[PDB]
Design a binder for these strands. Sequence first.
DNA 1: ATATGACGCT
DNA 2: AGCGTCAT
Length: 430
Amino acid sequence: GPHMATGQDRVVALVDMDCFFVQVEQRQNPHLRNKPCAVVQYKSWKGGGIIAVSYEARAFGVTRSMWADDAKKLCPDLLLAQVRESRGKANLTKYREASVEVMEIMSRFAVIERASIDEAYVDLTSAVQERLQKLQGQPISADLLPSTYIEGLPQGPTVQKEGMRKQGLFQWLDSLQIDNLTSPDLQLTVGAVIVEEMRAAIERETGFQCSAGISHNKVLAKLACGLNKPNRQTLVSHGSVPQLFSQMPIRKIRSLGGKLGASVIEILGIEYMGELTQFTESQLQSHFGEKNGSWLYAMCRGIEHDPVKPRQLPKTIGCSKNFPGKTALATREQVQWWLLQLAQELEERLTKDRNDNDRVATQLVVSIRVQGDKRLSSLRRCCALTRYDAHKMSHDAFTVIKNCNTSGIQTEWSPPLTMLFLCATKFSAS
DNA sequence: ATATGACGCT
DNA sequence: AGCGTCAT
Ligand SMILES: Nc1nc2c(ncn2[C@H]2C[C@H](O)[C@@H](COP(=O)(O)NP(=O)(O)OP(=O)(O)O)O2)c(=O)[nH]1
Ligand SMILES: [Mg+2]
Ligand SMILES: [Mg+2]
């Protein structure tokens, strides 16, 4: 009871850029701003595949993984920016560089864990602590939180969004107790003040807008972030969890969006996160494993312990290209030439990485997919990465996969390869 | 014909 | 080491 863990020790935030690749292209091309527009890869087959969609375009039903030609049917004025194509493949350098702009600003405020090209978690516990004494028991004005939503408020005894937002924020602040600086709700509030600052600095110094979640762990902060996208941040308190989880589909929680989430729903016969609280931890472990059972028992009560790992840089550097359908590679000459094209991009990203970040990869993973296989990878092999030489890396990669060719004729390659993937890993300081 | 990054299991 | 899962 007095020994009941509530998982309120940390203040964690998740910051995620709004339609990130679109904003990168809209900063560069002012004609795309404030318009329905999308970012697409390639062009020939059906206009290219969309990977990012402005909010103006989303209102017409344009989505990620839509073909651009089909998107034009939903939204005929849709504007398109195409990903740079280098050596016959996608080249994401502009967005990787834009991403570093954002990560470097966020890193001024606290320890960040890079979670993707466009989002990072941040552990605000320390900054909240020190910011709490410098404030010296002085109230927190609603002016310090001009874009914050308090999840679950307003409640109890306007028709417009901004009015609802301020009303819930007012109720939250009014009930706030400067409670020996130990109140978890006060800590979250101060955390939300800092995230307003971080988000203002990102937008001032890059032009990019973002959303954020603020809570006590990573799962709740990431969930919170998406509740009021775009250009807003959301505070999810410990006390908001029972109502929030009571109608929250299980698949919306990070790591439950795939097979494990489906077997939770199937084996237990439930739909929503809160229904997990009925079961004992042993029950959950017996269904889902000791690790998963423990994680689910705490998570459905809003408790989660994955730490914000101090990592601002990716741990692997990789490039890949799919060869779908008729384009599947069928000759040894084709396979060799695309391993070279991949190896050449990889070399120039590794070389820039070593200069920027004082490290060298030591392992090259080669990964191929053969025609007629539903998996991301059909086969994965490794070799030593001793030199950043594109010809050496592609030739080495060919060596470790060449035995996979079950072709009697020497020039041909069967079964045809529908994917090549080169990934550099196992870094050491340089 | 929906590039590429982190991590668990064995 | 190699394969499977989950995600943006
Ligand atoms: N090459 C490639 N890039 C992708 C893919 N999916 C996403 N991206 C790229 C493009 C994305 O812009 C970027 C970040 O992914 P999100 O945060 O999930 N979506 P966004 O930031 O656009 O919108 P909002 O966050 O407001 O919902 O990663 C993909 O399948 N392939
Ligand atoms: Mg985003
Ligand atoms: Mg994201």
